[PDB]
Design a protein around this ligand. Sequence first.
Ligand SMILES: CC(=O)N[C@@H](CO)[C@@H](O)[C@H](O)[C@@H](O)COP(=O)(O)O
Ligand SMILES: CC(=O)N[C@@H]1[C@@H](O)[C@H](O)[C@@H](COP(=O)(O)O)O[C@@H]1O
Length: 266
Amino acid sequence: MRLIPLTTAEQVGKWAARHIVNRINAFKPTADRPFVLGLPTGGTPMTTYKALVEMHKAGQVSFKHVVTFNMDEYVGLPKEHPESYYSFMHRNFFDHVDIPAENINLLNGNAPDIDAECRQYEEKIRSYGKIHLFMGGVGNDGHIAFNEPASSLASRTRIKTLTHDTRVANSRFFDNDVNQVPKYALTVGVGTLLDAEEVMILVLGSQKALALQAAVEGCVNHMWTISCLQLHPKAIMVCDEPSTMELKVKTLRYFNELEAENIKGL
Ligand SMILES: CC(=O)N[C@@H](CO)[C@@H](O)[C@H](O)[C@@H](O)COP(=O)(O)O
Ligand SMILES: CC(=O)N[C@@H]1[C@@H](O)[C@H](O)[C@@H](COP(=O)(O)O)O[C@@H]1O
């Protein structure tokens, strides 16, 4: 695994944005051979979305031949609701870039047949072949997407029941009312994520320090699903400073030596 120890959320956003752009440009995608990008929502990726839009506006990237898949979506939330992940993605990314609407893939949280919806999402991914870069965040409890504690490490896209802890955490988007937060979500699986060619996780804040420790210094286990990255051939974690507080000195020391040139940098 690579760990990129930066200082602020701003640096993290610029580092990740720059990584995605370079991956896309080196790939040279066409209509027959699009670049496949997996995307998350939430507080974490904000500075990344900001930086991505800037670089596009500056003419450093085109998303004309980029296909996107989102990780997850709330069940039973109207698509029009501003806190749905559909709304989040358009408001913060799709509205500002040159990506064709046929290239956008999102889970339908109001599908009448949930199993069929989840299965088709997996078929859609397979029809492209592979996701080239999946970007995500990590939960306080270590969840990757909505793969909550005790989710199978070989899971596929399916419905999951949100932990009480996850609902409390997300209630900041539902006017600090836990009761307003949906109980269920449609989510890609751990197996689904492991099938991506490259996985990049953004880690911000001291609230994520235990999760980062579990991911980096902990053992493989299904309580902290983020630990699946230890099994991935090409995983990257991009971190701010307070998120690194729970690591051993020698661990952080190692990654600082490793990445000094790739962050400094600036
Ligand atoms: C609001 C938040 O941080 N809650 C977390 C922790 O359990 C969780 O609900 C999220 O879905 C998780 O992916 C974290 O992403 P963000 O902290 O919103 O960037
Ligand atoms: C000069 C150098 O050390 N290069 C390595 C690279 O080969 C590697 O893959 C990654 C470690 O991750 P890995 O052990 O999971 O492949 O770190 C570095 O970027």
